DNA sequence: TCACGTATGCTATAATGTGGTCTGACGCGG
DNA sequence: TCCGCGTCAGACTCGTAATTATAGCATACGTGAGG
RNA sequence: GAGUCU
């Protein structure tokens, strides 16, 4: 997988309702990952590594 | 809450009083004189130093909490044998113990087959020599290049380098995911297979019948010497203890038993056939 | 030289082996003609034409 | 050695020391120079024993002269080296350490017993917080965690008034102080006042533990380990690699961590160091002990040098690579080999080619045994060299042993028992195994380099077992289906096909021959073709009413080749059998006919003779494969240009925005799928009847002798499907997803695919080959699960004396009868006395086998349905009776007592799933669904008979159906079901119920790519909970402005309109609701997700109009892969997401109160005046319309049935028929033949346990689920002797759960969950008495079934009589 | 008996009790050295045991009769 | 590899399931005969003794 | 490949694997179910004991076959004895409660 | 009483809280 | 509802065998042989 | 780790 940003989404794997939760991953060649993702209730969230 | 053993011990030693100059002397004064409170609060306080020394001596033998444990034992001996009468500091004196107790205990536990202090310290002289030789001989140094630098025996350099060879684990796979490891290949040579087991049963049950075949005085004298029927493997001279009581007649009768048996093996179909084996 | 099973073709659906065989036959057919003309020793202009 | 049973318990500190023969107090292994056991080391000789046999270390005492002598010097016993794997040891831990299996393995055991959370216990273990063990004044509560600050509070204030401590010491003292008798009483007495479900679940499980903990003789102290046992050295060996390197087990490395930290801990306790240091060491001890027992469980697993984690003790018991699955339920075997197999078409069916050098190494001991008897070798060493030199005398002796001495041949994968068959060896020249062609089908063995394993049955028992049971000639029929597996294929079919088939005149037409021998005479003489129509005199032997054969001579109008083939045919069969042109399907029936008429011997000879002549005449024919043989129809480019224009039309209308993307997608696939049919029909019409020949008359035609056609028509290899790709059209290719690519490949393999057509073809190629590698593991795991549950089941009894069975109606589904009654009921004991229609004389006895003779009489009298004795209905406690199972399908006769039905049943289900995952996947490229079921055409005249139907007449004048599961029958003259169809919802019927129809009439018509929502009342449409943006969306066009509305579901729906249900409410002209005729329901059809609506708000409607159109996108080609999950879920007994509701008790319905949309049903039965209430969701439109005489198990909500609700309300026979029909329908879609009895076997094991409701007179009482077999043995004694009868309810169980529910823990730990099974058995103190096959396979005993059946029951009478 | 063991099975009944009876008789000729009833015809002790069952000479009950005869004759020489 | 005269026709079931029937002449010509060079090492080590 | 009798593994005491080690053939649970299904329990017990682990079985049986007597004189696999000691080293009492 | 490998002992400038992989899935509890 | 833990076909063939780093010297402790 | 049969 190439480094850079790549937007992705769990379609109906996240949750029971089937809210397509969209996400992002900034992938470096060295260093920590940076994930941004929605929740069922459409709040934005951040997780590193 | 944090349920890791390491970050918990590190939290405990954190809230500990970092001692100053005549604080060390004040406690260590009553420590040598023998005080409950002094030995603990000197050791308790100086645990923070042990961790730093143990942190640098890592990825070598044990994990990390193991270096701290053996490091704490060196700090305890530093406290028992500190001299406050001397104007010199404790952190100077205790650094000698914590580097020492960790070095010396790693040497023993790091290896599966226990390697002693002499053989390891021998080896370190060869290893540090090897690094100096390697930078100017580009390629790694040979056992003769190391032996010839120190003017010491080639067998002695080979002996110690052979003990450095590490142990491969049985449960380690050659394959990858889950194919086969070394136990799945390596044979138990101590337990012989049915083919080799039944041959010694047939060889020895064949001999039990060939004993009854030869003459009554010949199979008595021959069997009890080799310890085949008797209890102890005696010699020509010791067969005299039974009834023979002879040195010459025992030797003539022993060989007479074997000569008649050599013709019994040439007729049954062995002799040169069973000579290869 | 070899006798293969024809029932190993329709199921497999690898018909290239049969086109290879037909063309391989044609290829040897030219070889066997040139082999015959070299044994007969006809003419360099004749080998040139064929 | 011999014993009765095995028991598991906790190890007491006292018990651990009993096993130990010395304490390992040092981590040292060996001295680096003098390689010996170290002083009280891990490999100590003083403790575990000497390295050599009868030799001490120092070497003072050697050999057996000194028998039981312990050396004074080194301290080592002069005994065998065997003692090194047997003697254990111990370590006296300075501080207690919790056992990780009795802490982490949930339920926590230590936590469940203390009623104290696992989180709370871990805080005490890692020394974060104190726990009060016994607070003297109850100010400090028991089992209350105090933080390090909160401990300092009580310390100054109270002090001795409380005993709160920390570490494993505290949890052990906490387990010591607790009284099981006093707390158990309290839990019982305080459950009465509340009585809920999860309290009564957890408090009853705590009672079951406390009671089992006392009776097991276990103490809660032993949850925490004070002593740590050591494994024997040989079991964790330090052995030398050839070179000077050594190698060691990972346990040695984990033991060394534990000993180092334990010895250091003792020294730091000696030094009276601060507690901070002591705590760290106690934490590290817990870590090293927990890592020794189970490495990867509590925290990060301790990695060694390699970076992988160190393998722990638990690891060598747990899972696949554990002792169980790899070194105990399966083994490496002596007197075994393998090689590349090849054909042996000269061989007989009872033979196999076994190489010289293989057989020499295989039969070594038997040769040494003959060499001593013939007097050629004096000793074994002498005999060894004679064989090694390969002397001429030795080949002759090898030949002598092998005669009449069978060998077993095996192939991977061993899917069913026929994967191993026995043969008499034939020594051959080369190094390759020669396999008999006819058994190739059972092995699935093609010669393209397969390898087959060889096994020698050594013992005389094994030689007889090989010859009597496992011989190839004994195993002809499949155990899965009563049909021969030994069936000619490939060249053999093609050869008999070429022989029998006739042709116009040919050489020598209309001749007259004396016999079948003169036909061979004119063929070999070259005066007649095999295809010449000729009159021949043939004498056929037909069997009389008695055993005697009657001879009958007659002139027969058959070809020369057909006369020659009669010579192979044994006497007993009619000549009519060889008078047709024979293909594979007919030749299979020839050996099935012959098997039932004549016997085993004739079939084995007949099958061979068919093989020989079949190969020979195939070779004579010179049938071949050329490029000209792949004829393409001349009218292919015509069909494609028409079909291209049709598809271009929908794509041009899509640009206009008339047809949608989904509609075009399904509509385009239907055009191309019918074009592929058109091209293929043109191809097979221009291929089959292409031969037009000139007879001696003028001109006529016959079937083509195109070589490829013969190969596919005969059924030798290929089919019409494959020929499409060769000559016709390649077709729609399948996406890796499963959905169908919109562009199909026009071209074929003869014409050649272009660059893109190939690239499209690869999508479907890789996905097929992908399932061959990956998805086989889901399927093969089913085989495994099915075997573990059915394992123990064996025929125990001849006749149970039960009068019960399952009523088997014939599977008439989808026009043609899919499975006759005859096939389904064949080989089954007649449960009830089933006579002929006129109930006045019995036709068949109650206790009698169903032979083909009786089955033929069933068709004469037209028996419709027959109650048949089933496996499920058996009242045998021990296993099953012979009568209930009936005929062994493999043998064609009554099943024997002792034969293991469970494993045979699991294999027959598991095999076709597993092998078909590899079959139409390597072979598969193209997609070929035809799910375009537009209309039912009835074929015979009949009266229309609908059932479970509620329709309503529309404006058009057409009977529109408004019920989901509507069925359409076809009733004949006398009154019996001939054809059956599924009419769907919103379908238009041609004629209503009871009306006559002719043959070839469209009786029903509908749109397949849409599920309409149809009304039951007329008036106007109202929009309710249909807000734009929240629940629905809107899109308009141009000039006028036609907008469509699309209903959003929870996926495309905001949090605003989640609890809003969108529905098209019906109203009248005034604006009020319209009541549905004869009900208090205002008319309201709830629209589901993605429901497209054309009519907007304020539109006039009649009854029968379509309100909305729900899309029906299912373009996936159903192979085994999509159906197996269904089969897995049925056997695992899973409720679906939307189970249909069923009536629990028979009686008068009254509808009740409502909860903001959700319905209640306070139903009050006629007899049971006490009510039964149950909540129902809002959106479920009910089938029952309230106030009605409803019985047990009546479909209230439409939808899928939970198998639990079936067994609970409608008994065992209902749920059995649900599983059999539902599972078997999946296998029937794929053409897989599995008898119902095999599914019924596993269903029986699913219906194993039963929950006891009412109290008994033993110790069942209430809530305790026990096996069915056990409670019935009690009920037998209760009905006679008296006391409280135990009322019961049979419960349904999934496979994975029923396997773990078995009392044999050795069966359970060998299946899965090894870590959990062993701990739950250890704490209960369970004893496994070795019941089933797994248990005896493990311990290395005779199976308690099959040949050993007789032996195990002989031991069981020794146990009874004294 | 050579290939086909159906006639031997038809005479006893059970395929499993057939292997047990045939093995019992095979072991008599293997160790005890009993003489065969059918001509040997150069076959293994396993096949002789099947042949004798097929013809109706060896059986679970017949073997118990003959075992009691040899056993009790020697018991009578004792008593 | 090598090219050779191949006839597609069945033969007494010796080409049953992709089983191949080859002439003696192909074996005689040693044309499908393959060379296999094989490496075996003999090591004198140093044991304790 | 072919093998009658050969080397045995260290802990399991089963035959080795493969021609590279001159090893016997693996009789897996798949292959075990086949003989289970037939009924041939002697064929199976042979392959579970005297052909595999049973140490007294394998040497004794070799001698029985050379004596001519195709006698089943079995015992109990060493791999089970290993299972017992591995479970007892876990701190779990597992014992053979006899007749 | 030495010979020999093995083990324990002490070094006084000051020094005082640690630092490899990042993506499975479908089921079923608590 | 989310975190945790548990399963995931059957044999076969080959192929190889890695790395780091621990100071230096003086008395103390144990066993065996020689005077 | 690269293969062979399914
Ligand atoms: Mg094939
Ligand atoms: Mg193959
Ligand atoms: Zn000794
Ligand atoms: Zn029954």
From Swiss-Prot, chain B:
Induction info reads: Subject to complex regulation at multiple levels (transcription, translation, regulation of activity and degradation). Transcription is induced during entry into stationary phase and in response to different stresses. Transcription is repressed by antitoxin MqsA. mRNA stability is regulated by small RNA regulators and various proteins such as Hfq, CsdA, CspC and CspE. Finally, the cellular level of RpoS is regulated by proteolysis via RssB and the ClpXP protease.
Q: Where in the cell is it found?
A: Cytoplasm
* Upper lineage: Bacteria, Pseudomonadati, Pseudomonadota, Gammaproteobacteria, Enterobacterales
Keyword Transcription in annotation: yes
Q: Which family does it belong to?
A: Belongs to the sigma-70 factor family. RpoS subfamily.
Q: Record's domain comment?
A: The sigma-70 factor domain-2 mediates sequence-specific interaction with the -10 element in promoter DNA, and plays an important role in melting the double-stranded DNA and the formation of the transcription bubble. The sigma-70 factor domain-2 mediates interaction with the RNA polymerase subunits RpoB and RpoC.
How does the annotation summarize its subunit structure? Interacts with the RNA polymerase core enzyme and RssB.
Result for mutant: residue 122 to T: 2-fold increase in RpoS half-life. Does not affect interaction with RssB
Note down the stretches annotated as region Sigma-70 factor domain-1. Answer: 4-37
Which one GO biological process term can you cite for this protein?
DNA-templated transcription initiation
Task: Give the annotated DNA-binding region, as residue ranges.
Answer: 236-255
Q: Which organism is it from?
A: Escherichia coli (strain K12)
Annotated Gene Ontology cellular component terms? cytoplasm; cytosolic DNA-directed RNA polymerase complex; sigma factor antagonist complex
Give the span(s) annotated as Sigma-70 factor domain-2.
42-112
Q: What is its main location?
A: cytoplasm
Curated annotation (Swiss-Prot), chain C:
Transmembrane segment boundaries:
none
Q: How is it used?
A: Co-administration of salinamide and rifampicin or salinamide and myxopyronin suppresses the emergence of resistance to both antibiotics.
Q: Which residues form a coiled coil?
A: none
For this chain, the Swiss-Prot or TrEMBL PTM comment says: Acetylated on several lysine residues in the presence of glucose.
Any idea what job this protein has? Answer: DNA-dependent RNA polymerase (RNAP) catalyzes the transcription of DNA into RNA using the four ribonucleoside triphosphates as substrates.
Can you state the subunit structure given in the record?
Answer: The RNAP catalytic core consists of 2 alpha, 1 beta, 1 beta' and 1 omega subunit. When a sigma factor is associated with the core the holoenzyme is formed, which can initiate transcription. The rRNA transcription and antitermination complex (rrnTAC) consists of RNAP, NusA, NusB, NusE (rpsJ), NusG, SubB, ribosomal protein S4, DNA and precursor rRNA; S4 is more flexible than other subunits. In pull-down experiments interacts with CedA.
Q: What family does the entry list? A: Belongs to the RNA polymerase beta chain family.
Which named protein is this?
A: DNA-directed RNA polymerase subunit beta
- What gene, per UniProt, encodes this protein? rpoB
Report where the shown chain sits in the full-length sequence: first residue, last residue, total length. 1095 to 1144 of 1342
Curated annotation (Swiss-Prot), chain D:
Spell out the Pfam families in the cross-references. RNA_pol_Rpb1_1 (PF04997), RNA_pol_Rpb1_2 (PF00623), RNA_pol_Rpb1_3 (PF04983), RNA_pol_Rpb1_4 (PF05000), RNA_pol_Rpb1_5 (PF04998)
Positions binding Zn(2+) 1 in this chain are: 56, 58, 71, 74
Q: What is the effect of changing residue 744 to S/T?
A: Resistant to antibiotics salinamide A and B
Q: Which InterPro entries match?
A: DNA-dir_RpoC_beta_prime, DNA-dir_RpoC_beta_prime_bact, RNA_pol_asu, RNA_pol_N, RNA_pol_Rpb1_1, RNA_pol_Rpb1_3, RNA_pol_Rpb1_3_sf, RNA_pol_Rpb1_4
Q: Name one GO biological process term.
A: cellular response to cell envelope stress
How this protein is processed and modified after translation, per its record?
Acetylated on several lysine residues in the presence of glucose.
The UniProt-reported impact of residue 765 to T/V is: Resistant to antibiotics salinamide A and B
Q: How is the cofactor bound?
A: Binds 1 Mg(2+) ion per subunit. Binds 2 Zn(2+) ions per subunit.
Keyword Acetylation set for record:
yes
Family membership: Belongs to the RNA polymerase beta' chain family.
This protein is called what? DNA-directed RNA polymerase subunit beta'
The organism of origin for this protein: Escherichia coli (strain K12)
Q: What is the lineage of its organism?
A: Bacteria, Pseudomonadati, Pseudomonadota, Gammaproteobacteria, Enterobacterales
UniProtKB/Swiss-Prot annotation, chain E:
Function recorded in the entry:
Promotes RNA polymerase (RNAP) assembly. Latches the N- and C-terminal regions of the beta' subunit thereby facilitating its interaction with the beta and alpha subunits.
- Record-linked Pfam families: RNA_pol_Rpb6
Source gene? Answer: rpoZ
The question of whether Nucleotidyltransferase is a record keyword is answered with yes
List, alphabetically, the SUPFAM superfamilies matched: RPB6/omega subunit-like
Q: Where are the transmembrane segments?
A: none
InterPro entries xref list: DNA-dir_RNA_pol_omega, Pol_omega/Rpo6/RPB6, RPB6/omega-like_sf
What family is this protein classified in?
Belongs to the RNA polymerase subunit omega family.
* Catalytically driven reaction(s): RNA(n) + a ribonucleoside 5'-triphosphate = RNA(n+1) + diphosphate
Source species of the chain: Escherichia coli (strain K12)
What Enzyme Commission number(s) apply to this enzyme? Answer: 2.7.7.6
Q: Which GO terms describe its molecular function?
A: bacterial-type RNA polymerase core enzyme binding; DNA binding; DNA-directed RNA polymerase activity
Q: What keywords does the record list, in alphabetical order?
A: DNA-directed RNA polymerase, Nucleotidyltransferase, Transcription, Transferase
GO cellular component terms listed in the entry, alphabetical order: cytosol; cytosolic DNA-directed RNA polymerase complex; RNA polymerase complex; transcription elongation factor complex
**Subunit and interaction comment:** The RNAP catalytic core consists of 2 alpha, 1 beta, 1 beta' and 1 omega subunit. When a sigma factor is associated with the core the holoenzyme is formed, which can initiate transcription. The rRNA transcription and antitermination complex (rrnTAC) consists of RNAP, NusA, NusB, NusE (rpsJ), NusG, SubB, ribosomal protein S4, DNA and precursor rRNA; S4 is more flexible than other subunits.
Q: What class of enzyme is it?
A: transferase
For this protein, the record's Gene3D superfamilies field holds: 3.90.940.10
Protein's name in the database: DNA-directed RNA polymerase subunit omega
